[model samples]
Target: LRAITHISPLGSMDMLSQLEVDMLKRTASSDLYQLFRNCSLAVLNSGSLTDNSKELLSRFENFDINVLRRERGVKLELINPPEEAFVDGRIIRALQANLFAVLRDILFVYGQIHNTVRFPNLNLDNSVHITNLVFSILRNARALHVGEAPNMVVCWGGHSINENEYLYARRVGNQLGLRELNICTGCGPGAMEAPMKGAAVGHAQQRYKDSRFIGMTEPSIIAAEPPNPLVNELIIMPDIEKRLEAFVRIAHGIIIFPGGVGTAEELLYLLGILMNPANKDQVLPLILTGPKESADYFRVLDEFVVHTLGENARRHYRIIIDDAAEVARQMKKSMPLVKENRRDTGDAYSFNWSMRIAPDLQMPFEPSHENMANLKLYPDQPVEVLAADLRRAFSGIVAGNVKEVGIRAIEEFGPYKINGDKEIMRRMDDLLQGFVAQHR
Candidate 1:
């Protein structure tokens, strides 16, 4: 049965000021209200029901949540939430708490950052400010652990991955947890959910109480790929670029599973940053692993990387197939190397502050048709620049694949026209074609 309920602040924080409640009360601005409503609806509708971002909004058109100020604190009133959010007339605690996180993050980003009278503009002209903003968001969410070691591993893959690939990702996650490593993901479905599922079992077996199953996501992608039930901490970054930066900043290692255009974008994003001469001494271990069935997938991916980015680009990551435990072991061994590098560079173990991200990589890229056509994708240019453009191309492709605005943009304008060199275009086409032939 569809549920209508007013929830208390037990699972959520109750200390919001009266003024803050009024600001979030849907009357301050419709833009703020709309963003908050969409995110709130997404949090309430937790499950892998459909990947259609537009359809999710349409299906739950009647669902509306309001922020109310009570005598003691804040309360959330749900008009028409999904039935799954409730059991025996009570909302699930995890989902309710996640809703609070949604509220906290939205208010933080829009209210604090966007509407701040004290700070007119954060002056994003400096790349340092962009990175500082990421730090502020994470710190506000309490996602950063000051006393922790280099142990959290981020897993990247698509929600549309096959069942076998999902099983293998879970196996790798369990192995990772057995070695006392925590798990981080895009907070979506498929590989994201699988790893957390397996890691829970491993943590239970080891009696690991301090473990974290953290899921970091952005607003645009959350509804299409909702948070899995296993995620204990949920973070909703403002945009895609910031979300990606958040992953690289906090993550010690990244394990890539078989996926689609979104995963390809992630791999290229990492490679582009690592390929820079600036991060030459960086020691972030990356593994591209899958089930025995997807060995050829890695080969094609490897070929694409070698062809476009050159042999130097392939040096950043290792490809492991079928052996989940060995993958975990390799990740574990890289910890010392990461620790030594961080210690030597006088960098914090919790966040990679010393790792430099070029301004181009930090800025949010608008995937317009003209922007796609203007991308500098020549092989003669810096490989890092090429990788960034390639990532942009894939980013657009990902948007067109799942996003409502992107879909409408493509509908209004046929297809994104990306003009590049012959070799680069050929390899990029071949790689994307391989993904399209598979799960996409």
Candidate 2:
């Protein structure tokens, strides 16, 4: 392992006042520090595959990082980073860039908006304000590139996938690249990394230069699943909810690879939004694919969705198994429709401003035992609302499985108690058990 000081150009810059900087520098909040520590550690562990957050934390007990502001910009200094990130005592170039990207996001969110004039009011009607806050964060990160075409495909999947499924994701990615599409992912391993890797090859073969591999993440999850090295552009959203919104808004098409709870959570999130009565005809394409060996796995997933959210949810996404070329071709063919839809709606090509994400999907979920126990997984409510609530449930399971705070909460208390209509609970339990049996 090696400790090094790395300087990175602020390809993205934030304009915060001194008072805001002082407020964040208080260090009393520790929220900023905590965010910095965890996210930076994830970047350092960019290549590890373990999904256990607590284990990852313990393994890097001595790692520390701090942000230093200079006249020109900010520089990140690392102490005792993972040796995996170092080649012969020199910090790997990609890791160093990601370190600075982490610096940009943490300082931007913490210093600029945590408590400042930027937060003029905090009311329910101001959920729009919160959404704008997320937008400004991504925009500050230079994610909202103007005039860029509709080519970014948001890939969501598991970090714990097996080899065959991983290769299948790459196959889909290679096909996308052959068609000149860019790749974006949650910025982790398994399906997340595979498509970007494949796309790089496709871009190389086509002599296409300047292909963008964007990776989006949040702090709590980043520690467990750090940004993959293949990511050329990294954007860290303020929270998981915003991270999900970022994924959907920026995506022209979404290709889902086989994944675990996190991936399932993502699926439910998009389903909830698409099922919204307001967005029925949106042209956003959602395709789920996996290797042939995982066909039974897809059946279980399809059954779970059909059983719970109803057949309407089943219609929201297509399951294409083992056909990478078909997956890529379909996503590519849908691009024109997606583009025309954006044009018809007067929305920008780079962002989906027309997609109305309900306030339910915007609010961050603090996974507590009581909250987890209180999730409504039954069918009385509107299917869209139910989908949103269930998305939170799956997100909480993801937290318990891998996030630091969730692990601690589980350890301090016990497994979260999910109580709902008995039938729903049975189906949910069966689905989770199937995941453990087939995918775990």
Candidate 3:
């Protein structure tokens, strides 16, 4: 099933600089090469049942991709690529486009931002610069549209959801789509895929032509949660922090479904930002919803937030139960307010430029053992700061659960030792146990 195939870009970056080609030419032994290969491999491994990067890499040990320069542009020589990525001995059209997206993102966006020697203009320490970096990446991917309204609903949830939960998500997505809203997700299976799956039908029924199903992911997480087939526009942020930032920045509103620690981490990220005094007037609509059977799921989550960040944190979002149409209606009804708020604040309806995000939330948090243990998880600090630390803790847990680096760290060392106040630790332990009990 393995073949040597040369692939040309269907929609993304057509030409690469000589320097970029040379950098990618070091594919046999280079970090950048490894990054590009792993990302490309993940994109090709779509529809996989497993979320383990280690397993995928092991299965595709001989998979290799080389960047070849041509007179007109460039071509990708994929050696031993996954057979599922092809149809009739030719690469699938969407997969080809996605493969090129990997190249355009890693080689162009990633290289430009991190290559200090070649591009010293971006300052990682500066919050404004980091926001600009996200904007630049999205802009290059053609993700940001000037004439578009604030209709992109960023849905966050787990890939390990149950069938009933998946159906509920689909119903919700279908309703939202019928109202002419677009869909965006973490771009994986389970809950992430269901909404887009449902929305496509909803859009088709309504004769909506320009529906956007954007998928935002990063290199490390993409291996575990590879892009689902429904993703028409895929943008790879540099890391998890930037990925989260990109979601909040562009989202007209957010919908949270039942999920594991990853979903919890996303909720905390949004709440922490909204908790900021500067965002008190911000009118971003946040909703948490699930099927009737999953009522206990949100209950446990709500308890966790109250017990940890206090009741004030709960004010940032609304929780709706069992009604999919209402969730869509609520989001639709809020659009006018969102538009009015953006207009009043003079912020672009496409990207949220007026909101103020602290440097702590913007900067990348390395989920190393030491960094995870050193997180200040007490309530003595500002609720926003505590929320940030708590977000980091859950992020580390997510990394340990599926991310390749985190899994290796656990195997080499041991499980992460999370320490905090006695009461906070008790509540945290209970919430985590609840998640495990439900297999979330």
Candidate 4:
């Protein structure tokens, strides 16, 4: 059922400079090619059940995409693409939008920040360098609309959640939408898609026309977590670190639903940032909630945090059991405080400017065997350092489970051995085993 097809731009990306065109063409044979191809394939493979990034690529190895220069603008030439992306021999309109979004982000990151000549100060030591880069990417995607309220709730959870869990997430989203709050997620299925779906209906009933369902993702994991159809605004950050940064910077509050290792990684990333003394007064509403039946899941996650980071880490978030309306009410009630804190600190209402995120969270962690085994998975270090290290450990497990390169590394090197303080390791293993038992 696969076919070759040519499509033109539907929104933005109408033209490219000669140099930009050449650079894009060169990507077909360059190191960035795989990243580009894999992300694009993910967009086309939306709604897929499988989470194995490598398997998707291997299944569609004949698939290829090329950017063709034309007098009017540019066109995408897709060859041997998946049949599910098409209907009556034409690609789905939503799929087209996501496809163009992938192109926009990849090209922007390469031409703007990736090239040192374009951005001479894009360095690791400079925090502003990253802030500017992240802002530019969002601005280019048209995600940052000035004068908008701080109402974005970034929902973090797994794509492989059960039906009851999915319904609970939907109910929460419905409640959030009824309160006129927007939804953002990692842009995949299961819990990620459910919230947006519920919010859409909630927005409709409330007569809210400007509701935004933003989906932020990066290249390495896109194949495993393709953007769901409900994502009206899809943005592809350059990497996972930047994606995590985007989540925290734009979020008015964050809600955690039941999930697996990836969700744990995201939670740890945020906690690591919040643990910093510099961000002591920051007003971010963090809530962990799920269905009544899912109470045990949250307990284990809470225990894992307390055991690994410390009991103080529990103070960063509130656990709300089985009450969707109360969760939304709490987030809405906390908004005034959020607004006041941002105003007092002179932070941007649209983007968080005052929060201090350390360089440890900014630096990209490659999930190599050496890197995974070498993580400082002990409590002897600072709490934030331990959080960052734990985040890296779960991040590695995520890669091993779904990412192409990490799966290949695991296959070649056997299992990754994570050595740490015996007690810490035991707690981590117990939490991970719980996730596996629930098929999370």
The model with the greatest lDDT is 3
- Show the lowest summed lDDT stretch of 10 residues, model 4: 21-30
- Give per-residue lDDT, candidate 2, residue 105: 74
Q: Each candidate: what lDDT?
A: 0.82, 0.78, 0.84, 0.82
Quote the RMSD, in angstroms, for model 3. Answer: 3.2
lDDT of each residue in 263-363, candidate 4, tens digit only: 68778888988888899999999999999987777788888988788889977899999999999999989888888889888888879978989877888
Give a tens-digit lDDT track for model 3, residues 307-396: 888889877888999999999999999888889999997998889987888898887777788888788878898888888889888877
TM-score for candidate 4: 0.85
Candidate 2: regions farther than 4 A off: 1-10, 14-31, 44-69, 77-93, 117-119, 122-125, 366-376, 395-419, 436-439
* Best first by TM-score, ranked: 1, 3, 4, 2
User: Candidate 4: where is the Cα deviation over 4 Å?
Assistant: 1-6, 15-19, 28-34, 47-63, 78-92, 111-113, 117-121, 366-381, 396-426, 429-440
Model 2 has an lDDT value of 0.78
Tens digits of per-residue lDDT for model 2 on 1-440?
66565545445444445564454455424666776788778887777666675687679887887655555444556778777777877777777767767766776564455555555564524668766776777787777888777998999888767788888888889999999999999887778899999999999999999889899987767755777779988888876677878888889999887776556777888888999989987889999888998787778888989999888786678999899899999988898888889888789898887788998778767788877777877899888988888888876767685578877877777777588788987887788888888745
Evaluated at residue 190, the lDDT of candidate 1 is 85
Alpha-carbon RMSD, each predicted model: 3.0, 3.9, 3.2, 3.7
What lDDT does candidate 4 reach at residue 80? 89
